[model samples]
Each structure stands twice: as structure tokens, then as C-alpha cells.
Target chain A: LDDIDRILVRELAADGRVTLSELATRAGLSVSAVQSRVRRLESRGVVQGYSARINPEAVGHLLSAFVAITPLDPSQPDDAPARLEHIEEVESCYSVAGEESYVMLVRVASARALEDLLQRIRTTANVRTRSTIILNTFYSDRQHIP
Target chain B: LDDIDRILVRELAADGRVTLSELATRAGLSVSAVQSRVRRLESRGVVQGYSARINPEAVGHLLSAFVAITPLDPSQPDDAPARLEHIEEVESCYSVAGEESYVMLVRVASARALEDLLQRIRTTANVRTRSTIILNTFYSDRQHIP
Candidate 1:
């Protein structure tokens, strides 16, 4: 029965809109019972929220790439984060598990658009970068929810 | 039956695991017929695939930011795209309707990791960037197949 919560989560993981009533009937429980469990799970942060996902590429912003960056300033540690406060192309950055300290993914309107953004990183942060244009994407699907 | 396909897609939009028999019966079609439509949908890219949407913040990656960039070498057109080719943090880039030519979204591992990426941006491509930190994200739902 406890695993059902995980199952419910997995089902919801694929899609966020499974209602308490749907989940309840599927779980062989009453609507109120399912509601109670869902609330408990959410309060514990196990269930985040009902969310919608989108394909930015389909909406006309087609370019996609991953950038690897290295800043020159070893002194004045505050400068980097401060620098981050200014740029928009950097959608998400990760410290990463290997080789690079950070990995960032960005989508731009076009190829020309990216060059302009890189210039700002150069002037403000005194940085150098290496980037890869996404040839093909493989990992957009949702993973199994625990 | 066609309406059922729409309903099934909507359910999958909210939940993907509804069995074909359940979906077929709900949509008023035979299981085999529903299966064929689903296969067609999957192949056509209407249904990308199943995924487990992980919370970006939970796994040592918490920050999301955007950047707008302009090419430093406006006169030398080709130079800009060449520059963008080198930025690693420059994930999905776009050309948009505005003063700035492009917008980028980035993911960072921590508050400090981006600093390292900044130093690298200055010396490399002659790119320029303006950035913004997202305050809160309200929605990022998947699109309906048109």
C-alpha cells in the first residue's frame, strides 16, 4: 500500500494532473483518503505541485547549446556571483560531477544571438568559454519518480 | 474514437499511463485502433517520451538565470556566430523580438561556480551579454499538439 504512494507519484511524475479522485479510485481507496495522503506527501515536499512543461524550440526559439566557462579572477571571490547577476543567456549552471566546474544550458533565438551574449561575459567577468551546439537532444523525457 | 484520442492525449498531458483499453473504451474505440494511434503519435513526435521531472534545485543545481546578448563585432557579421560557438555555459540561445538580439537560460551548480565561468568568457569570443535572475517561475507547461 505504501508503494502505491510511490506509484501514484510515478503516475503523477509522468503528468502532474492526476486528481485525488482519479488516484483514489485507482488505488482502491476513497477520494478523502487519497486527498489526505496527497496533502501529507506535499507538506513533506514529496509531491511538489501540478506543473506544466513546454517545448521552447517548438515556439520559435530554436537554438540550443551547452557552455563551459572559466573565470580568471582567483582574487575577490564576490566578483563571480555578482557577475551572474547581470547575464541572461545562462539559464542553468551546474558545478558538475567531473572535469568542468560548471555546465550551463541556454536557448537563443539564433546563432548570431549567442555571440552577442558571450561578449558581455567577456567584458564584465573577464572570462573565457567553450561551447557545443546541440547536434541532437536525447534526454528531455521525465525520469522515473521515486 | 477521435475524440477519445484527444481525451487520451489530454489525460496523458495530465497523466500518460491510462491503459489503452481504458482509454480506448473511454474514447469509444477498439484497443488495437487506439494502439495504432498512440504508435503514430509517438513516432510523429507528438508524444516525446516519458520522463521524471526532477526539481532543478534539489540535486545541487538550484539557480536559473537569463541573458540577453549583442555581438561586439556588429560590422563583422560572421564573427558573432563564431564567438558563440565557443561559450560553454551558453546553453539554448535564441533570437527574439527586442533591442537585445538573443536570450539564454543557464543552470548553475551553486552560487559560486558561475564565477569561474565568467573569467573564461572575457578573452574568448567577442561576445557581449546582459543577464537577469528569474524571481519565480509560474508555469512551463507542455504544449498541445496542433
Candidate 2:
């Protein structure tokens, strides 16, 4: 993609609901051009989807934690994550290249709630976990396009 | 929030730019009512903002990595993160407990690019880092309200 295409993506990343005219003004292009580019990006699967970034605290999710997980049984199926998908608090889960097979982001209402959630995760078929609570976030929701 | 309020947020979370009419139709509410709830949610800071989720790989960010970090000098001011903010490759940075003082999720164009970014992060004043790369993502952008 060209620089304009990347710029378009960045603009959308900042605020997905921005009007085509406003985006065009900032990107120095016509509204039609902006719409065309955005459509092209969406069609190409480059722009996955749009969503609101809610305040976790406002939503009652007062705690955020990450867990590094591994399966106790090496021969287990890949359905562990599917089970995890059924879980409400598992915000994001990634399979990583490390001792742990997966890294998951968990958000919850309270410490006591986290205890039950952690226990549920621990007892999941073959899963073993090492979790860490987030103390502070310097910056998030920033994905500057290159 | 009540069921209606939660449903409003959920619909917006799925499609932030959905028209008020379409939202009201699906929500089984009047257009003006949906608009009012959305406005109230926004003013209340419950609906923070909206943004597009771009496919990192499609955007040339082929690699994602996380780092566990510690500052070499404990007394130093928290300047590293502010500096890290300027580096576009640094997607999300967090301060956490355990052996590391911070954890960061970084996305970059290539392994070579990551090497340079890691070098830059390592040399940040009073910082030390242990990094791991992500192989796959099981689930993301799935924040369901209770």
C-alpha cells in the first residue's frame, strides 16, 4: 500500500466513525477518493472491523490481568482456545512462541471474581497458567500505521 | 446499565457507525430513544470512543511481540515510557508486577525491524527487556458486557 493508503488507515484507527468529508479534508483528498480507498481497504480485508473502545472501569471490569498458559498434556487438541472463547473475561488471547503456549488478557469486576475465574482457567482440561495483574498502563489503543 | 443500555453499547461495539434507525430497529426501540441513550452514554464516558481494528499483517506489521522490562536505575523518573510513545512500533505499554516492572505489546513490519526496535528499547535510559514473539492470536476484540 502507498503512503496515502497507510494514512487513511491511520485516520480510521484514530476514529473509525469519522465522516468521509472530514477524513478527506485531513488526508487532502476528495470525499469520493476517501470513500473509494476505505472501501478498497475493507474489501481487501486490511480493515478488519470497527468497534468502540469502552472504559473498562465504567463497564465494571475493574481488574485486568494477563496469563501465560501451557497445556499439561502435550497431545491435547487445539480446542482449548475455543473453550476460552466461551469465557466472558478473556478479552484477547494469543498463542506465543515461548515456554507458554498462550498469552491471554483477562478483565474482571473484582479480585474475588478473578479468584473464581483463575480457578476455572486452572482446571480447564489440560491448561496450566501463570498470571500477572496489570498495575498501570502507560499507553494503549495506539497502533500507528507504517 | 439496564438491558437496553447494554444492548445499545453492544450494537455500537459491533458497528460503531451503524445508523440510529438500524440500531433502533434491531434494538426494538424508537430512533430518538436510541439516540438519547447513545448521547447519554457518550456524555457519561461509558462509551469512550470508536476505532477500526486493522489487520496487523495486512498493514505490514507481520510480527507482534511482548516484553518484560525492568529499569536498571530504580530512582530514575518514568521517562522511558514517554520516550517509547514516540516510537510508532510500540503499540501498547503497561506497568505490571512480578519480576518485571513493565510489559509491552509491540507490532512491527519484520523480524529485522523488531531487532532494531528491541535494540532501541534496551538502550532506553535505565531499561532492561526480555522479549517474546507472538505466533498466533486466538481471540481479540471480544468484550461482551455482563
| Highest DockQ scorer | 2
Interface RMSD, per-candidate values to 1 decimal: 9.5, 1.7
Model 2, residue B126: distance off in Å is 2.5
Per-residue lDDT of A1-146 in model 1, one digit per residue for the tens?
26767666666666555667888877777989888876776676665545333344543446766665566654545244346544555655544333333445656778887777666765776766666566444224333232
Residues B1-146 of candidate 1: C-alpha lDDT, one tens digit per residue: 25555665655545454677886877788989888887776665656654434454533345555555666776766343345544544544555444655555555665576555444443454557665654443323234332
Candidate 2 chain B lowest-lDDT run of ten: B74-83
TM-scores of chain A in all candidate models: 0.74, 0.85
TM-score of chain A of 1: 0.74
- Candidate 2 lDDT at B3 equals 82
Identify the candidate with maximal TM-score. 2
Steric clashes per prediction: 77, 0
Candidate 2 C-alpha lDDT tens digits along A1-146? 88888788888888888889988998899999999999999999888788887767777888889988888786756567877777888989998887988899999889899888888987764588788999877777677676
By summed lDDT, which 10 consecutive residues of candidate 1 chain A come out lowest?
A137-146
Candidate 1 vs. true structure, TM-score: 0.48
